[PDB]
Amino acid sequence: FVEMVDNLRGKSGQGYYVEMTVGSPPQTLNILVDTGSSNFAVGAAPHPFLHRYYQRQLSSTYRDLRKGVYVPYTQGKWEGELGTDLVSIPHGPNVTVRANIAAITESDKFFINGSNWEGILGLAYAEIARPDDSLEPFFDSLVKQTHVPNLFSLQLCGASEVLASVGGSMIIGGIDHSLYTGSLWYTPIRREWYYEVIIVRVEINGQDLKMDCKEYNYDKSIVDSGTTNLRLPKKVFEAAVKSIKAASSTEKFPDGFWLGEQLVCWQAGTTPWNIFPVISLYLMGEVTNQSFRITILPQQYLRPVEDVATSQDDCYKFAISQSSTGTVMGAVIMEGFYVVFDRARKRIGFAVSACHVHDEFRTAAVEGPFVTLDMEDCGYNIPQTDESRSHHHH
Ligand SMILES: CC(C)Oc1cc(CN2CC[C@@]3(C[C@@H]2C)CN(C)S(=O)(=O)N3c2cccc(F)c2)ccc1O
Ligand SMILES: [Zn+2]
Numbered sequence: 560f561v562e563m564v565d566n567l568r569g570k571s572g573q574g575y576y577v578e579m580t581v582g583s584p585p586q587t588l589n590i591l592v593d594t595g596s597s598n599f600a601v602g603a604a605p606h607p608f609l610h611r612y613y614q615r616q617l618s619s620t621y622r623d624l625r626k627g628v629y630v631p632y633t634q635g636k637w638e639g640e641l642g643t644d645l646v647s648i649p650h651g652p653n654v655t656v657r658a659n660i661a662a663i664t665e666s667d668k669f670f671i672n673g674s675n676w677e678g679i680l681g682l683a684y685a686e687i688a689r690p691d692d693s694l695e696p697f698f699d700s701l702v703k704q705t706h707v708p709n710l711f712s713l714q715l716c717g718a719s720e721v722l723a724s725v726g727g728s729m730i731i732g733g734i735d736h737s738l739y740t741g742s743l744w745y746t747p748i749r750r751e752w753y754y755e756v757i758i759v760r761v762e763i764n765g766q767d768l769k770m771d772c773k774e775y776n777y778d779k780s781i782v783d784s785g786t787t788n789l790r791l792p793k794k795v796f797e798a799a800v801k802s803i804k805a806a807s808s809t810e811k812f813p814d815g816f817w818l819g820e821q822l823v824c825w826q827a828g829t830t831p832w833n834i835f836p837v838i839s840l841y842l843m844g845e846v847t848n849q850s851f852r853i854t855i856l857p858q859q860y861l862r863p864v865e866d867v868a869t870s871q872d873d874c875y876k877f878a879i880s881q882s883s884t885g886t887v888m889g890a891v892i893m894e895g896f897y898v899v900f901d902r903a904r905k906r907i908g909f910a911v912s913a914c915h916v917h918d919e920f921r922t923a924a925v926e927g928p929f930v931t932l933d934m935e936d937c938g939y940n941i942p943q944t945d946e947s948r949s950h951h952h953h
């Protein structure tokens with residue numbers, strides 16, 4: 560696993576990427592590591608924001624699948640052509656595999672200017688692959704074609720003219736013990752589509768939010784390396800902000816700050832970290848009635864942004880935001896921990912990162928067990944659409 564350490568890079572808030580090669584001879588591309596999606600897709604046509612792209616005509620091993628795919632989202636979209644080719648991760652397992660590749664021909668608000676990545680590695684399950692679940696995801700192909708164990712783990716690490724560079728590790732096929740401290744605690748994967756989990760309790764500075772736990776998972780809770788923020792459902796978001804405004808009340812920040820639309824600054828190094836509370840998310844444990852907590856510091860949720868106008872100040876963005884599609888445990892959550900995607904055992908492990916950002920008074924934590932009696936089911940059941948229902952599953 561030594562050779563996979565530090566195999567991720569990126570710019571702050573622009574996702575983490577790993578180097579990959581596609582085709583024969585190998586074409587090198589930087590690929591966004593996304594546990595929030597399930598397609599392996601690469602820019603395969605010139606784009607203002609792409610320095611380079613996949614040129615299928617240049618690969619002797621490319622096989623066109625003679626099928627197009629259309630992938631829209633709320634904030635962006637891409638369309639492309641399906642095919643297969645030889646794919647490798649140079650700073651990954653010492654194997655080359657034949658995987659599906661979506662060759663992105665048209666896109667809108669998908670690629671980011673200066674992010675230095677040209678494709679996406681969707682690490683989630685076939686259920687959410689486009690156009691449907693018969694398009695085998697990359698990781699499934701990797702495990703099927705090689706002896707690579709059905710597990711990967713992510714260690715996402717910290718951050719004038721440019722955004723800060725971030726570093727990290729994607730350990731394919733195992734757990735690297737030098738990447739964490741203390742115990743690895745596991746939460747069950749609720750269902751294999753997104754990496755769906757269940758949050759049972761939420762505390763802000765040791766104070767319970769006092770909400771029906773179903774609210775925490777309305778309409779789902781997922782672990783997403785492709786999202787920067789800790790995203791919370793509307794009602795949960797409102798309660799966390801009121802709680803966070805309460806603890807930091809000595810500072811009257813504008814409304815733009817709480818919406819993540821404005822930065823707040825202090826004199827260089829005078830950040831009053833102590834007025835901001837810790838946030839603990841209790842995750843369902845492997846044992847009924849048991850849970851563990853992951854505690855995040857304000858250093859995780861107040862993202863540094865270098866003001867070119869005021870370089871003599873430390874400025875921050877609020878990186879907790881409102882969601883209408885459930886909780887998203889993005890980079891804000893992941894950066895404090897070593898996160899184990901144990902597909903083989905259908906569970907996600909969390910441990911304190913060997914690289915987490917902390918002060919001399921508090922530390923990001925992973926602690927357990929915690930118990931509850933006669934505990935209700937915190938999981939939400941998404942209303943079944945007739946379209947979804949009509950699908951056959953052969
Ligand atoms: C690194 C980040 C800053 O940027 C990107 C992150 C991702 C990964 N992943 C983010 C969440 C996703 C789906 C997408 C696959 C789902 N959401 C509801 S979304 O907001 O619609 N969204 C999204 C967000 C932006 C563009 C877009 F096409 C979709 C992909 C492309 C990015 O540029
Ligand atoms: Zn049928």
Ligand SMILES: [Zn+2]
Nearest residue numbers: 692951952953
């Ligand atoms: Zn099917």
